C-alpha cells in the first residue's frame with residue numbers, strides 16, 4: 111500500500127545492528143556545488159526510489175565526525191550525503207545553505223546518467239541532520255524549507271534557540287554532559303520552542319558533546335532511533351511508529367521527551 115515502504119519488517123535487533131538490509135556503496139562528489147566537499151552513500155539494491163538526507167558537521171569539524179551515519183542510514187534505504195563546509199569556521203546560517211546545496215546536488219546527480227545514483231532518488235522526500243552548528247543549521251533548513259520530511263540534529267546549537275516556525279518532524283539528540291552546547295541552554299530550549307510539529311528529545315546519559323558522532327559507544331540505540339525517525343517520517347512508514355515514538359527506557363538515556371508523535375484515531 112505505502113509506495114515508499116522499503117525493506118523487511120523491522121525489529122529491534124535489525125535496527126540496532128551495525129548494518130541494515132541493503133548493500134551500500136559510496137562516492138565522493140567530484141565537483142561540489144555550493145559546499146566544500148561531499149561523500150554520497152547509497153543502497154545498491156533498495157527496490158525502489160529512496161529519500162535523501164544531507165548531514166553537516168560542527169565548527170572545526172569535517173565529514174569524519176558524522177560519517178558513520180552514512181552507511182548506517184543508506185543500508186536502510188536512503189541516499190545520504192555528508193559534507194565538508196566551504197570553511198570549517200562557517201556559522202549555522204551558512205551551514206544551512208550548504209546543506210540545502212548538497213541536497214540540490216543530490217537531485218542533480220539523480221538526473222545525471224553517469225552518476226551511481228541516477229534514478230535512485232525520490233527528490234520530493236528529503237531530510238536534514240547535523241552536529242552542533244550543523245544541527246542548528248539543520249533546524250534553519252527545516253524552518254526555511256517546510257517541505258522537508260524530517261530533521262534529526264545532534265547536540266544542536268544556534269544563536270537563537272527559537273525554532274517556533276518549524277513544522278518538520280524533528281528528533282533532537284542531546285548529550286547530558288555537553289559543555290560546548292549545554293543542554294539547558296541549547297538543545298532543550300530549542301526543543302521546547304517547537305509547538306507545531308512531531309518532535310522528540312533524546313539525551314544520552316553521561317554524554318559529552320560528541321556523543322552521537324562517529325566512534326560513539328551508543329550506535330545501537332542512536333542508530334536505531336535515527337533510522338526509525340527517518341523511516342517513519344520520510345517514508346511515512348508506520349511500521350516504524352513504535353520505534354520512532356517510544357521511550358527507550360534504557361540506562362543509556364538520561365532524558366526522553368516526545369510530542370505529537372503517536373497517531374490517534
Ligand SMILES: [Cl-]
Pocket residue numbers: 287288289290317318319320
Ligand atoms: Cl563536552
Ligand code: NA
Pocket residue numbers: 142143144145
Ligand atoms: Na562550489
